[PDB]
Amino acid sequence: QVQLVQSGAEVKKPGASVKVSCKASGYTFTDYYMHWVRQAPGQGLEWMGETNPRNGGTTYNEKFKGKATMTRDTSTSTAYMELSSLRSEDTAVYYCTIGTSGWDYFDYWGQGTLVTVSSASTKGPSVFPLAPSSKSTSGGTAALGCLVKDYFPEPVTVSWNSGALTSGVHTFPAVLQSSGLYSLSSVVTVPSSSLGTQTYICNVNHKPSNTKVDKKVEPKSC
């Protein structure tokens, strides 16, 4: 039952600080060192450092000394990584990871936290239905979805029926609009036969604006 659950996506202005967390469960927290890994487009995956949970002892990758500060709270089984003097270049996905077999491997990883550094205004998304109609059928199959428009920054996550519907779901990578806002669609194919008995709800989450939107996609009579 080993799990590493990281804090949500964040958007910060340049010069500010951010403290990302990693809640560990299903094992004795003090048994394994906690590691932090950065994934930025271009620089790729980089190991940032390791924290000894017993004493809080830290070994940093020299590149991240001063920029990153690693700490832990053994009582809450939580590891923290604080980034200071944020700049545009600090925009990346940060992962926490452990190895449960000495120093042989990283077998468990957190889901990652996207930290975006920007002076632009945070904007929650507008969520529109992509209703199934005679125009969105393909021999017994109906396509439907949600259009998630005009948000900033990334990421938005989309689930269907509170995570109960995952088969045939395609949540497209976001596009950058000329306005500087993002847009994406999440679609799903289902049987056209049961549009009258099944309910399809997309759950759009936009953690940087603290927004959660549930949109029921109703079949269209066209």
């Binding site: 790729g44 995956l45 980089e46 190991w47 070994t59 990758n61 020299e62 590149k63 992962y95 990871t97 120093w103 042989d104 491997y105 990283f106 077998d107 990883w109 957190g110 889901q111 990652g112 507008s126 529109f128 239905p129 992509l130 209703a131 109609s133 125009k135 969105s136 059928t137 393909s138 199959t141 396509a143 979805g145 259009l147 428009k149 395609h170 497209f172 990578p173 976001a174 596009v175 609009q177 847009s183 994406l184 669609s185 679609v187 194919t189 269209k220 009579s221 066209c222």
Partner: protein, 219 residues
């Protein structure tokens, strides 16, 4: 710092065929304890990396029999005996023999499956978005192969330019296909200037282009 160099940058393999990726360390990677901590990870888009191989040749619990690792000195290799659809993603080698621990730049494995024509779907703007003063029309191309596809917007039979955006998915881990959305965005005023909204799709899988269309407002 140890530099890990991967070759090739990209690989496209037919299911059932072998795959081989190389990893070169800038210097030797023997830990103070005498072991070589060389690992291989597979990362799928939007997911965390998943452990495959550790200490050069040891396969991790639950990892399929088809994966194997080999090497010594400064040259290491990951091998997949028979590639499967679930193997898509980016493979990274990693050394944890010398601080700072370092990753390779990644090798992208793409699956060379059979041709699959897209299923085409079209969505007029919602009544809620129209009320706001904007109209987005979405054309969906679902579960096709190869990735190359041409989508053209036609408004009252006139070819459109400069008002659409498209996004393509990653290759699916189960069926090795792609999906593509093409969104045509107009102000409510511009959308009301024309009646027929069409998206024309060209793909290797189709004998002739497929057009999906609708008449605005008329439902």
């Amino acid at each position: 710092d140890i530099v890990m160099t991967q070759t090739p940058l990209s690989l496209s393999v037919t299911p059932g065929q072998p795959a081989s990726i190389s990893c070169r360390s800038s210097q030797s990677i023997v830990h103070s304890d005498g072991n070589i901590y060389l690992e291989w990870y597979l990362q799928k888009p939007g997911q965390s990396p998943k452990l495959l191989i550790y200490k050069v040749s040891y396969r991790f619990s639950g990892v399929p029999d088809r994966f194997s690792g080999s090497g010594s000195g400064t040259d290491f290799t990951l091998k997949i005996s028979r590639v499967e659809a679930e193997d898509v993603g980016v493979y990274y080698c990693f050394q944890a023999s010398h601080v700072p621990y370092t990753f390779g730049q990644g090798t992208k494995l793409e699956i060379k499956r059979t041709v699959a024509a897209p299923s085409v779907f079209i969505f007029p703007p919602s009544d809620e978005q129209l009320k706001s003063g904007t109209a987005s029309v979405v054309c969906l191309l679902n579960n096709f192969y190869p990735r190359e596809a041409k989508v053209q917007w036609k408004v009252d039979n006139a070819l459109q330019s400069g008002n659409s955006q498209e996004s393509v998915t990653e290759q699916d881990s189960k069926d090795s296909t792609y999906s593509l959305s093409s969104t045509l965005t107009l102000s409510k005023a511009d959308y009301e200037k024309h009646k027929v909204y069409a998206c024309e799709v060209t793909h290797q899988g189709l004998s002739s282009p497929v057009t999906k269309s609708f008449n605005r407002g008329e439902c």
